[PDB]
């Protein structure tokens, strides 16, 4: 008998989250969060996947469960 | 032998002792006349620390610095008739209020004679304590006799 | 006059550090003005008691790393209702005056500091 607080486990933004860009000129690519600006905008870069370094909103992109 | 301690107070010559000293085996009317032998100089309002050893009235005199500053002042009044305030401003005593106030049991935590001589010399609100000035603003100018009493 | 009083506090604390060599940190808590006034009257000869803001003592020792860094071992011992006693008598007589005199039914000495080291006394 212990503390059974269950999970409520999300995927967090951080420096180094890899993201799936789903709207725009990229529209389905990978990138990585470089430097996090505020509650809604982030700064992403996708160098091998091709998308140039740019700021984006967190509505245009979805977080993937992988990190580095 | 027991210990009884009372604090008698301001009276002119023989000026409610019965309610305070009935349980210490002492008198009521004879105790009022027993305090006349101390506060009779000393005709200014002061206190008397009475120490009754359970069979007699033995009153002592408490050393009061404000009453000693009033002892360097004018005593003129008799009883109940001066019709305004029964107060009188008087002589300065620039050095007599510095030896007597520094000898009244050295109260207030003084580390100098200019400390006690200003604590009991700048508290003048009935006397002038100067020939051409006033008290309570001379504490920063009284710098004499500090090494003599200490 | 808050800045000038704090500058006065820094100045007098740097003054009383570099003049004395015997420190008694005392764990005095809820002490009365009847006890303290008879401490001010008694210690007129050798010791200087200094109470006051022990978390202002924190910054005072923060700023005093350049001169005499051997006072670095005191900020873990400023915790609790403590004060300072500055004297030149090393162990015995000051500890006999502070602890034994004026007890009723909190005047102890919790740290003794002599020239860099700490002593249980």
């Amino acid at each position: 008998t212990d503390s059974i607080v269950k999970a409520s486990n999300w995927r967090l933004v951080e420096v180094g989250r890899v993201v799936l860009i789903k709207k725009g000129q990229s529209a389905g690519k990978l990138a990585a969060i470089v430097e996090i600006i505020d509650q809604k905008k982030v700064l992403i870069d996708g160098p091998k996947a091709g998308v140039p370094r740019q700021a984006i909103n967190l509505g245009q992109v979805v977080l993937t469960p992988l990190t580095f | 032998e027991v210990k009884y301690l009372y604090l008698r107070a301001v009276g002119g010559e023989v000026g409610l002792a019965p309610k305070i000293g009935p349980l210490g085996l002492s008198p009521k009317k004879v105790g009022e006349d027993i305090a006349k032998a101390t506060k009779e100089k000393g005709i200014k309002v002061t206190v008397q620390l009475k120490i009754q050893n359970r069979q007699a009235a033995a009153s002592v005199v408490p050393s009061a610095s404000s009453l000693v500053i009033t002892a360097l002042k004018e005593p003129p009044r008799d009883r109940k008739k001066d019709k305004n305030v029964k107060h009188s401003g008087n002589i300065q005593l620039d050095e007599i209020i510095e030896i007597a106030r520094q000898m009244r049991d050295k109260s207030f935590g003084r580390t100098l004679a200019s400390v006690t001589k200003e604590i009991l010399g700048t508290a003048q609100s009935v006397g002038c304590r100067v020939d051409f000035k006033n008290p309570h603003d001379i504490i920063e100018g009284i710098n004499a006799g500090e090494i003599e009493i200490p | 006059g808050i800045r000038e009083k704090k500058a006065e506090y820094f100045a007098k604390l740097r003054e009383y550090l570099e003049e004395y060599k015997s420190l008694f940190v005392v764990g005095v808590d809820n002490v009365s003005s009847q006890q303290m006034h008879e401490v001010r009257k008694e210690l007129r000869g050798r010791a200087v008691v200094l109470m006051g803001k022990n978390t202002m003592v924190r910054r005072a020792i923060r700023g005093f790393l350049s001169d005499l860094p051997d006072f670095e071992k005191l900020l873990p011992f400023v915790k609790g209702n403590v004060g300072f006693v500055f004297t030149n008598e090393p162990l015995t007589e000051i500890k006999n005056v502070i602890v034994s005199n004026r007890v009723a039914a909190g005047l102890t000495v919790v740290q003794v500091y002599d020239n860099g080291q700490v002593f249980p006394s």
């Binding site: 008998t1 503390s3 059974i4 607080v5 269950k6 409520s8 | - | -």
Partner: protein, 191 residues
């Protein structure tokens, strides 16, 4: 200003264990079991270890962070009510008519019965909630004691008892006669 994260730390002592499914919070310990439904408040529980539970609110406004702090207060109060338990002492106020307070069983419903209040004839009756027992004080005159687990249950029965003895159509500062919460302590005698 939309705080990015706010947190509180709930300290869980030894003899009790929490059990949180999504917001249904049960706390079990040496006096019994307590449950509370926090689904209306949207806060996030995170076990850091057996003794410490961090709660957190991300991206919340001002009312949301206030809700977080009162979530901490409620969980701590359940944990205190299951470790120690709560105990309110109420002492009467009566000028001329001694208030006669009993506990009677009317079909198993356990009513506190207030009689003779300011010379009234209305037999005032108060329900007792669940969990709270009610004792009468030894060797302290005219006192009643409510002891139980929940803060809300004990305190609410105390307040519902107090407000059955209000005074209508009088000067409420002259006729002070009533039943009043005196002391708010714990069941454990040491604490």
């Amino acid at each position: 200003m939309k705080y990015i994260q706010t947190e509180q730390q709930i300290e869980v002592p030894e003899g009790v264990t929490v059990s949180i499914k999504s917001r249904i919070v049960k706390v079990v310990g040496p006096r019994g079991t307590l449950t509370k439904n926090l689904k209306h408040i949207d806060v996030t529980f995170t076990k850091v270890n057996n003794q410490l539970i961090k709660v957190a609110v991300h991206n919340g406004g001002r009312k949301h962070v206030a809700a977080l702090r009162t979530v901490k207060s409620l969980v701590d109060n359940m944990i205190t009510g299951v470790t120690k338990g709560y105990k309110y002492k109420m002492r009467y106020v009566y000028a001329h008519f001694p208030i006669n307070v009993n506990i009677v069983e009317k079909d198993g419903a356990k009513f506190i019965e207030v009689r003779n209040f300011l010379g009234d004839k209305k037999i005032r009756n108060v329900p007792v909630r669940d969990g709270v027992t009610i004792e009468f004080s030894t060797n302290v005159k005219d006192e009643i004691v409510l002891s139980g687990n929940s803060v809300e249950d004990v305190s609410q029965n105390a307040a519902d008892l107090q407000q059955i003895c209000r005074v209508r159509n009088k000067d409420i500062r002259k006729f002070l006669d009533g039943i009043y919460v005196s002391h708010k302590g714990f069941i454990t005698e040491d604490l």
